[PDB]
Amino acid sequence: MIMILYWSLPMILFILGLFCFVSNRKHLLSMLLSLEFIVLMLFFMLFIYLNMLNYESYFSMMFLTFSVCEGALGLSILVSMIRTHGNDYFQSFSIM
Amino acid sequence: ISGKTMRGGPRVPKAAPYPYKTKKYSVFNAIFDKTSKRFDENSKVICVEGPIAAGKSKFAKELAEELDMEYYPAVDLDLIYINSYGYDMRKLDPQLPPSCRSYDVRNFCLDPSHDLAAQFQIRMYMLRYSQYIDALQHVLSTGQGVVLERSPYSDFVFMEAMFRQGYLSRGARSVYNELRQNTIGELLKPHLVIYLDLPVDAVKKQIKARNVDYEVQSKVFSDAYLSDLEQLYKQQYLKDISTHAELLIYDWTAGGETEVVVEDIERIDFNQFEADIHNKKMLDWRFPLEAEWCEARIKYCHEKPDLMNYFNVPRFDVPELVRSADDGKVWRDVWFNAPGMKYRPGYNADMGDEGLLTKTKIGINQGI
Amino acid sequence: LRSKYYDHPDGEDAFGKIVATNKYAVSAGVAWSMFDVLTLSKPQGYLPTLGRFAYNTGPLMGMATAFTLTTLVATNARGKDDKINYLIGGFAAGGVFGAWKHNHVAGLCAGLFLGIAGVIKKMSIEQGWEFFPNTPIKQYGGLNIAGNDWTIMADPPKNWTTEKPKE
Amino acid sequence: MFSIIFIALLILLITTIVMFLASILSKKALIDREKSSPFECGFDPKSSSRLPFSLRFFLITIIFLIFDVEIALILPMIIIMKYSNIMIWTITSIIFILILLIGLYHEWNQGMLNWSN
Amino acid sequence: SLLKRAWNEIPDIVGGSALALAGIVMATIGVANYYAKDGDNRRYKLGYVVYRHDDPRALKVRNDED
Amino acid sequence: AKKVKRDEIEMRSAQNVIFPILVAERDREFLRQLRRNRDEEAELMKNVP
Amino acid sequence: MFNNSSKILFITIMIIGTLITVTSNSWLGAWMGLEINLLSFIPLLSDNNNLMSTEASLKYFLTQVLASTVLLFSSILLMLKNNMNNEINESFTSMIIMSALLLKSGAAPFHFWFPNMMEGLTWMNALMLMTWQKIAPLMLISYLNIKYLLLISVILSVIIGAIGGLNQTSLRKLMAFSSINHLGWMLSSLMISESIWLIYFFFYSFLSFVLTFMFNIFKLFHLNQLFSWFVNSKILKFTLFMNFLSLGGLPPFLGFLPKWLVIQQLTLCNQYFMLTLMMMSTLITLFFYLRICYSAFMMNYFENNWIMKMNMNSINYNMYMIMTFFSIFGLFLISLFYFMF
Amino acid sequence: MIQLMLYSLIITTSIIFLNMIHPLALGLTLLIQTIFVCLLTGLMTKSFWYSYILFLIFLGGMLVLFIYVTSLASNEMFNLSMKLTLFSSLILIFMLILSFIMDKTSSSLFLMNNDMQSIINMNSYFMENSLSLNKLYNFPTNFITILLMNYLLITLIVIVKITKLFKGPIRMM
Amino acid sequence: QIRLLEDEVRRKMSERNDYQAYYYRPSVAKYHRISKEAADELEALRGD
Amino acid sequence: SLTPFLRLPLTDLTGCLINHQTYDKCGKFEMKMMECFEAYGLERGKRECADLISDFQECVGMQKQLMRFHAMRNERYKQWLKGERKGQEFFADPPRVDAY
Numbered sequence A: 001m002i003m004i005l006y007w008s009l010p011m012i013l014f015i016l017g018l019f020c021f022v023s024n025r026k027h028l029l030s031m032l033l034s035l036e037f038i039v040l041m042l043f044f045m046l047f048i049y050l051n052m053l054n055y056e057s058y059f060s061m062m063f064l065t066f067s068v069c070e071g072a073l074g075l076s077i078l079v080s081m082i083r084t085h086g087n088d089y090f091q092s093f094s095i096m
Numbered sequence B: 001i002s003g004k005t006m007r008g009g010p011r012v013p014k015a016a017p018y019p020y021k022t023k024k025y026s027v028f029n030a031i032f033d034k035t036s037k038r039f040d041e042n043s044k045v046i047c048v049e050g051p052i053a054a055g056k057s058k059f060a061k062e063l064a065e066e067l068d069m070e071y072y073p074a075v076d077l078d079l080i081y082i083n084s085y086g087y088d089m090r091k092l093d094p095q096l097p098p099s100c101r102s103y104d105v106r107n108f109c110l111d112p113s114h115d116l117a118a119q120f121q122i123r124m125y126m127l128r129y130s131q132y133i134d135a136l137q138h139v140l141s142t143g144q145g146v147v148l149e150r151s152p153y154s155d156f157v158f159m160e161a162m163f164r165q166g167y168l169s170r171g172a173r174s175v176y177n178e179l180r181q182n183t184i185g186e187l188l189k190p191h192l193v194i195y196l197d198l199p200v201d202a203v204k205k206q207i208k209a210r211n212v213d214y215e216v217q218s219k220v221f222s223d224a225y226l227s228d229l230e231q232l233y234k235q236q237y238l239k240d241i242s243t244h245a246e247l248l249i250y251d252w253t254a255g256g257e258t259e260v261v262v263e264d265i266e267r268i269d270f271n272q273f274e275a276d277i278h279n280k281k282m283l284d285w286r287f288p289l290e291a292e293w294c295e296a297r298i299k300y301c302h303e304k305p306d307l308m309n310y311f312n313v314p315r316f317d318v319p320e321l322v323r324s325a326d327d328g329k330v331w332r333d334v335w336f337n338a339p340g341m342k343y344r345p346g347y348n349a350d351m352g353d354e355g356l357l358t359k360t361k362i363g364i365n366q367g368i
Numbered sequence C: 001l002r003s004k005y006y007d008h009p010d011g012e013d014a015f016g017k018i019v020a021t022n023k024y025a026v027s028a029g030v031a032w033s034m035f036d037v038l039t040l041s042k043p044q045g046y047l048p049t050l051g052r053f054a055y056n057t058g059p060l061m062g063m064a065t066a067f068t069l070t071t072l073v074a075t076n077a078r079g080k081d082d083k084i085n086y087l088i089g090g091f092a093a094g095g096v097f098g099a100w101k102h103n104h105v106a107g108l109c110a111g112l113f114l115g116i117a118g119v120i121k122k123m124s125i126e127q128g129w130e131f132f133p134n135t136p137i138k139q140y141g142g143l144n145i146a147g148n149d150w151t152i153m154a155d156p157p158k159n160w161t162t163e164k165p166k167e
Numbered sequence D: 001m002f003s004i005i006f007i008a009l010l011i012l013l014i015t016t017i018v019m020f021l022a023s024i025l026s027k028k029a030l031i032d033r034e035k036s037s038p039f040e041c042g043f044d045p046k047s048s049s050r051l052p053f054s055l056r057f058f059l060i061t062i063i064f065l066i067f068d069v070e071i072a073l074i075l076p077m078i079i080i081m082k083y084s085n086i087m088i089w090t091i092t093s094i095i096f097i098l099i100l101l102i103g104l105y106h107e108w109n110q111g112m113l114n115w116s117n
Numbered sequence E: 001s002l003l004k005r006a007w008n009e010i011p012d013i014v015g016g017s018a019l020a021l022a023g024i025v026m027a028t029i030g031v032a033n034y035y036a037k038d039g040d041n042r043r044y045k046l047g048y049v050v051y052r053h054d055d056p057r058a059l060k061v062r063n064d065e066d
Numbered sequence F: 001a002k003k004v005k006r007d008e009i010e011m012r013s014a015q016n017v018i019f020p021i022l023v024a025e026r027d028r029e030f031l032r033q034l035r036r037n038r039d040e041e042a043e044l045m046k047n048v049p
Numbered sequence G: 001m002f003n004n005s006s007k008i009l010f011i012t013i014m015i016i017g018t019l020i021t022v023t024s025n026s027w028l029g030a031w032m033g034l035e036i037n038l039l040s041f042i043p044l045l046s047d048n049n050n051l052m053s054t055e056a057s058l059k060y061f062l063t064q065v066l067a068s069t070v071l072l073f074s075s076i077l078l079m080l081k082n083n084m085n086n087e088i089n090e091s092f093t094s095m096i097i098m099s100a101l102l103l104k105s106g107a108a109p110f111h112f113w114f115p116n117m118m119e120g121l122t123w124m125n126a127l128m129l130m131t132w133q134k135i136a137p138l139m140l141i142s143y144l145n146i147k148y149l150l151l152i153s154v155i156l157s158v159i160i161g162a163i164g165g166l167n168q169t170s171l172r173k174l175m176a177f178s179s180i181n182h183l184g185w186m187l188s189s190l191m192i193s194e195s196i197w198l199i200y201f202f203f204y205s206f207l208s209f210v211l212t213f214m215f216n217i218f219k220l221f222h223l224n225q226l227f228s229w230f231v232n233s234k235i236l237k238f239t240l241f242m243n244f245l246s247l248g249g250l251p252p253f254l255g256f257l258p259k260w261l262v263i264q265q266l267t268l269c270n271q272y273f274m275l276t277l278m279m280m281s282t283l284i285t286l287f288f289y290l291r292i293c294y295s296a297f298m299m300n301y302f303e304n305n306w307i308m309k310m311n312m313n314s315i316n317y318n319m320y321m322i323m324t325f326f327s328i329f330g331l332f333l334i335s336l337f338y339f340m341f
Numbered sequence H: 001m002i003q004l005m006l007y008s009l010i011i012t013t014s015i016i017f018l019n020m021i022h023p024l025a026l027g028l029t030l031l032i033q034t035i036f037v038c039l040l041t042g043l044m045t046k047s048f049w050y051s052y053i054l055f056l057i058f059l060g061g062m063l064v065l066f067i068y069v070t071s072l073a074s075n076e077m078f079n080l081s082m083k084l085t086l087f088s089s090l091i092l093i094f095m096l097i098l099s100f101i102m103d104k105t106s107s108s109l110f111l112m113n114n115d116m117q118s119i120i121n122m123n124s125y126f127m128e129n130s131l132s133l134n135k136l137y138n139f140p141t142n143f144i145t146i147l148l149m150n151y152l153l154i155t156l157i158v159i160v161k162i163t164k165l166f167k168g169p170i171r172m173m
Numbered sequence I: 001q002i003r004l005l006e007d008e009v010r011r012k013m014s015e016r017n018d019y020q021a022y023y024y025r026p027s028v029a030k031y032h033r034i035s036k037e038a039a040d041e042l043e044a045l046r047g048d
Numbered sequence J: 001s002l003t004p005f006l007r008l009p010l011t012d013l014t015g016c017l018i019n020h021q022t023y024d025k026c027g028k029f030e031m032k033m034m035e036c037f038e039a040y041g042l043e044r045g046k047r048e049c050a051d052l053i054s055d056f057q058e059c060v061g062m063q064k065q066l067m068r069f070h071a072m073r074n075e076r077y078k079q080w081l082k083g084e085r086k087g088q089e090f091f092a093d094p095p096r097v098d099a100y
């Protein structure tokens, strides 16, 4: 099928990104590491679709701007994490 | 800090004080009016504490006069048992059930073992707490510093001393700590604290000098009780507050002169601690940006009702502090039908207020 | 492999019915089982995790099969496909529930919960109404849905005419 | 591209050969428990280097991520100046650089650009 | 005053902003000048552009010398 | 800036005299290829259902 | 909008973010608005005075980031196969979009994060989360037309939303489970129309807008505090708590009218079985509301006696009393409303 | 051809990335992949302009998280997994074998490279990225860029408020 | 009579969505032909 | 394309985000189709736009043609692996580079 010969690989890569975002690693940063991994794969598919259009790749910039802000915001929340808990370990948070 | 001699004259405010008694200061008021513009060298908080009957009041008034400081008289239960119109609530006590009977310092000195003592001690903490916040509003809105006699920080000493003598129970002490923990953290600690160390024998002599009826006749002011207060001020309170506030200790400035004391205060410098940001000394009053100033001002000027709603900590396993439901109904009937308690202050027509048809205004940081 | 339960009359195609009901037995079992092994039981090791999948799914398969067999057996034995058949069917699965839960009462009472459940399903089949029918009325606006537009950009000219075409 | 990748690999191979020569050409002597000890001015070290190293420019560190992603939007300017509407290109570009300056001066005035103190 | 303080503290932001202000000014001259010449209609066109003599655009052909 | 533009336009003007030439060539060979593909398709898949 | 000028901004940018989503004529445009909304809420939500608040700022961030990420994943996939923002016949690719949106709003199967982040929010924060944050997600689900997936969430929402709430004593955590149930009613109302949903949402926000103030004005966070709470007139306290009944949708009060119009339309559309499970499950929701009313309907209590006085903010209370009045007498104004016909 | 080998590597590096635990091991894996994805994207496009931008953008994020990794997760451990090395190396060669015996006219992506375009396409003879990036700064889509600007600036206000610089540095206490 | 007809009428509208009252979703093509306009505008400007 | 319910002025902001109207082989194909959506509305348009949607999808998505192409290649390989072709004459003559 068309979807299997052309769009399978990025999707299989995407789900592997999510399975990193949920696996049990001690440090919160392990979530941030896997966060921009997924974003890297989202860019890849979005770039497939935008190129089916002849001239629409400019929207890649729009996507990248929101990619950094969620990473940048994701990093700020970690900073605020440290200065109330002292450490970023997942097991240090109240389970609720 | 700069007495009248140092300035050579009366305090000159940097800008006109904000009328904090009449106009609210919310977020949208903070946009046009800023807080830091009014702060001087004298924009500080002073707590003039000591043992029982050490002439703190006289010393404070004189002191607050030299430093152009606002003086706040020490709280007393008259603030609870005398309404605005002046009527004495205590006259209603023959009607009330025994548990809800009025209780004061007179009663404490005369029947200290009564179960209402635990009530009485919490009220004093609550009163100081509200008064303390009122001082902060005056400081932040006017820039003039304030002189307090006893802060809520020092109030747990009396509760602890009463506990050692056995007047209170385990439960009452447990309840008191939870209130204090639930509430104390939201205040700004004083810049300066002054203590008047009168030795234990001296205060016992001194109390008889006042010749107050109930005190001399009482048994509470024993060597053990008065000794407990001394151990509590110096070992727990003073050792703790000195980490934040400058601490001066005198044998008795009430028996001494204050002009020497003011000249002692002005020697103390309050800027050396400013250098390090995280230095504990006077940490609370270190606001980096103008936003932080206004936030603190808003909290005490505009969110005091929140501050006074934290005293709602439900604890019923303690039987002393619980008020029976049948009494509550009766007490509610008598208390709120007294002259001047029908409505909020300034609306009880039977007490002489007029124009209620065309009146719509209510006070700010006012009850109800 | 894809058999529908009511594709045939009630006393028919046993192998068709068992597959249809066991389908829903497995799906519900796994769906609940996923929550059980992660959120409630939390077993450790790759082998015991299967026990939770088997434990929550296994007997739940036994129930569905029991209902089909008893319902199918009753349909032929009595000589009529009536509501009591499904009522008779339900008590079978309830009996399996007790054996699953080792509880005499749990199986008995749950049979009644299941028994009346089946009865109503037969009611639906016999009277001609559905449990989750496709919505006949689906509203996509208010009264002025085509009028309330607030956009500012000028809409450039049209390219289609409602009028009949000219030639 | 495909030319560049080939030379990229060819260079990497060449540079790799250089130490692979150095590793053999290097004089070889028995390694001592002290020869491989870290260097910290001749006195044994108190603290591993893998302890948490405090940070003071964390705030700038985050602002750096942002300011770059606006470099992605200024760079295309030149390429599309001959081809774009001059009002739209002129207006938008200016209100792009004013926004950046205003943001910078705002934080500079608020003192966030200064390090933690 | 203000001018003095900055000119003493951060002279670059004054000089830099002086040229920045120059950009806005002579950007406002050039942009207005651009439509004072009808520069949307450019005498040299990218690609091979051919019009019919009756097309409306065929009237607007900018007529220049070189 | 004038001289660079002068040179660029001269380079571009040379395209417009060559660009029509290539398009003429490509079409006459693009079409010829299409016949071959339409014929290769016929032979390749004679027996497909 | 409580402390500083900065809080004023984040509130507005939240409004802009939500509007961009619900006014966007394409999935990609809609997704952008969600990102705008994301960072508008976090700074409002994070306060370092509380160890709990920063934890709340986390769970929300990880959940929302994943939701928008998976949401964008499917939207790209959706128009990779159809080449349109719309799918002619709904299929799996459209289901995946639905799953993300439900998680974005904390519907039943993916609600877990939602109550578990309510421990460390101020009341004013919970209102923004409970009411406004559910606009953008739920409003996009109106575009997708999968029945069984949406139908399953409703059935689980009312069930999990109710049964879970019985065991709580923290009002903030209790309201979360209460909100999950009302969310179930929306999604049920969303497979039939939107005008009902728009009406029903407005009433739901209205009631929650009221109950939040009463806790917010008097800073109550636990059931015990209700009994210890002091009020001058036990009649007054008795009447304030009569808003819970409206939140329970009892017909003498205004809060039933929303439930009522959702049944007159679901029934009109023959969804009889759904209403049985929903309306029946609402009773359990009505239950723990009464557990709160234990502190009001009985009206002589054993209460601590170191308070004689009520200290309350005027403007909040002034607006709260007005809102409460309609919450009890709002029924006779149904005549005026002309949005149901 | 290298496109298929790029497919193999991006798959291979993703398998291991699922198994990294040490944050820097994750980072090295991620950095390597950011190279390949950047390379791969430019194959199926009229220019590599976006690969340059993407590469530049992520490298900014790469440095910053090392600064925080070296402050928060400084003391952690690696473990060479002989299962992993064999598994990746086993499949990697396996995948590389297929790419040699693949009908790699079929595997090529249908997206039109610049050369894949016709000769008649007059719009393909301009600058490499003129038209594509054009309407990023023309009516009406320009307002989207403007909307980002506030969004980015408003973000810049969010970090300082979340961060609260004045209350100290960051240490893994 | 009127509420058994009005109800019946609404069903027909919903069955075929052939009226702009309630069961009609306005599909606007305005923006795309705005984009086509903008493309045409930019086509003229190209050149130097 | 989707239809916002709100349709406040904000929709003008993001309406023209992604389109086919800028120098595309399918610019005319989509304008007809989407026009027909505007004439009949969204829900009814999905039932009257059978041709326009299929043509537009077969112009952008191109699945219909790519999925012809593999049938030709696979059927070329199937013939050879069955021995029906030969190694020497496996492929046809290549096209000229200066074409297409």
Ligand SMILES: Nc1nc2c(ncn2[C@H]2C[C@H](O)[C@@H](COP(=O)(O)OP(=O)(O)OP(=O)(O)O)O2)c(=O)[nH]1
Pocket: B051, B052, B053, B054, B055, B056, B057, B058, B059, B074, B105, B108, B109, B121, B124, B155, B158, B159, B162, B215
């Ligand atoms: N149980 C209890 N009694 C208190 C407390 N604070 C003050 N008192 C009582 C103790 C004495 O009976 C009496 C002493 O009054 P003060 O020491 O405050 O003297 P006063 O302020 O009237 O003037 P002076 O101190 O002489 O300047 O009030 C308290 O916190 N708890």
